[PDB]
Amino acid sequence: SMASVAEYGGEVSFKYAQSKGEVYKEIVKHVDTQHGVSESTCAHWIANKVSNTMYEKGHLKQEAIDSIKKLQTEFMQSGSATQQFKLTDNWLQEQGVVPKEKKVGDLSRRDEVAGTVSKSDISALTKAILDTGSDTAGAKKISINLEGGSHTVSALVQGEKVVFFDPNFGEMTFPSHQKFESWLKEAFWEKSGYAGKKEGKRFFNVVNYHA
Amino acid sequence: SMASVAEYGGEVSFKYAQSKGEVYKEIVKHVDTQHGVSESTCAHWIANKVSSQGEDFWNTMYEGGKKGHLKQEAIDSIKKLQTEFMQSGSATQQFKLTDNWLQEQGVVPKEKKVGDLSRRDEVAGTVSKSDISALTKAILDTGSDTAGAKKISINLEGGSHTVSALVQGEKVVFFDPNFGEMTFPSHQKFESWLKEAFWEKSGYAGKKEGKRFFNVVNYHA
Ligand code: NA
């Protein structure tokens, strides 16, 4: 967003009539909302299989949809990913689903398998899904992270003058480094959708050209 | 919930009439294409600012009489470069292509020199929800000089997805709320289908290299 540029002592030089940034924020909201529905639906599917169908062509029963919507809302309004996944786990135990435990030395701990996937390797994920440990049978709730996109912005710095250009919003000018730095950190980073919801490092690369 | 399930000896038990997975694949296409447009537009903006003959007005990319739009000539040229960028395949070759275009337009990449040797003045690092201090320094740093132009690549947060499974001996039931329910009569048939068919066709695989987190929670059947 560029609502705050003038508040931080900058000027908007150009504003795109159709903000591809606003489209990106709607995409983030969509993918976030759809995670809630996916998590809630998988929880309901797991509870249904371990206790006999949730299906009505190509739709869930209305009572399943109402219950999925309820859990999804609660899931969404839980803060951290840790609290969200704890809320779904509590719901599953309330429905009589029993989480597996494993021994690590003498101690009982949750039978969760954490790991990594990539474009070219899902071997560890596949083994975690297929493993039933001591038993012949198991239900799994599988959380997977999706690839984020790539974005390019540009800047011209001339002494204390900073021109910042985001093809998703437009062009802004700040008359000092400090005014640009405060605006970028305190206004733009969150409001833009580039910050994300989770903690975690993402790469950046700056290529420098002569002015 | 595709035709690939039966090809790998499985059965579709349920198919969502409205696939949230198909919507997700359209989103991936959009965000990928929009990287092309963002890269090409930033390249043009950099060439315009560095070429500039004093005042901005003399050679703006902005349409004078149409508020909040680029000139049609700038749009056509941006679409040309974006196409070339898109056809490159390999992020290394894509960025090399943009760099060649920038030099063709008279833009001069900065070098770090030690004795007789050069390398590109490019600064990598990391950002997060709560820290962009290293990014901010890389943008503001002009090295030797008081002036410089920057093309800034930022990686975005991917979303999260949940799927589920039930394994009973050799029977694998896999459920993706974005597609539906599939059943495989052996582990082998599930593993081959997941790795060779589903992972790419789902949109979950991605285009770039990069490790992404998964978590499997096990419940008694
Ligand atoms: Na400006």
Q: Rounded CA gap, A39 and B164, in Å?
A: 9
Sign of CA dihedral B139, A149, B96, B92: positive
Helices (H), B52-152: 72-88, 91-104, 133-140
- Rounded to the nearest angstrom, the distance between the alpha carbon of A11 and the centre of ligand 1 is 8
Q: If you measure CA to CA, which chain B residue comes closest to A57?
A: B17
Furthest-apart CA atoms within chain B: distance in Å: 75
Which residues in B180-193 are b (16+ Cβ under 10 Å) and which e?
bbbbbeebebbbbb
Experimental method: X-ray
Q: In Å, how far is B144's CA from the nearest CA of chain A?
A: 11
Residue A37 is encoded by which pair of tokens?
């529905």
Q: Rounded CA gap, A206 and B149, in Å?
A: 10
SS3 content of chain B, % helix, strand, coil (to 5): 45, 25, 30
Residues linked to residue A108 through DSSP beta bridges, in sequence order: A103
Strands A112-117 and A107-110: unpaired
Q: B8 CB near a chain A CB, below 8 Å?
A: no
Q: Which residue has the tokens 């996916």?
A: A38
Residues in chain A within 8 Å Cβ distance of B218: 99-100, 111-113, 131, 133, 138-140
Q: Would you call A208 and B177 a contact, using CB atoms and an 8 Å cutoff? A: no
Reference B172, options A181, A74, A49, A8; nearest CA is: A49
Q: Rounded CA gap, A72 and A36, in Å?
A: 5
Residue B192 and residue A122 in contact, taking contact as beta carbons nearer than 8 Å: no
Q: In Å, how far is B65's CA from the nearest CA of chain A?
A: 13
Q: If you measure CA to CA, which chain B residue comes closest to A120?
A: B205
SS3 of A155, please? strand
